């Protein structure tokens, strides 16, 4: 049960949660600053 819980918690870091990508590197390297702050908000909300 502990292993399954840890795996399920780790798999939450590869979900888009409505954004365009699951990696912040792809977002901060292709989108302009004043608009890229929308997907990071969704990612933070999902992870929290």
């Amino acid at each position: 049960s502990n292993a399954q819980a840890l795996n399920s918690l780790l798999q939450q870091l590869f979900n888009k949660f409505g954004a365009i990508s699951s990696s912040l590197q792809e977002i901060l390297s292709r989108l302009d600053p004043p608009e890229a702050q929308v997907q990071i908000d969704r990612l933070i909300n999902g992870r929290l």
């Binding site: 990696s23 590197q25 792809e26």
Partner: protein, 48 residues
């Protein structure tokens, strides 16, 4: 300034691979970070 046959060696050269130190790599659209080793194994194909 109109065509597909462009000129290389402008700003995207091919560099060597480093080992025993984690670096930032961009491999066919990955943009990740990590270390590299030199373990020899044969399981790839011509397209993999």
């Amino acid at each position: 300034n109109s065509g597909t046959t462009c000129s290389n060696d402008l700003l995207q050269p091919n560099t060597e691979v480093f080992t025993d130190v984690c670096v930032d790599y961009d491999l066919y659209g990955i943009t990740g970070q990590g270390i590299f080793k030199e373990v020899s194994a044969v399981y790839y194909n011509s397209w993999q």
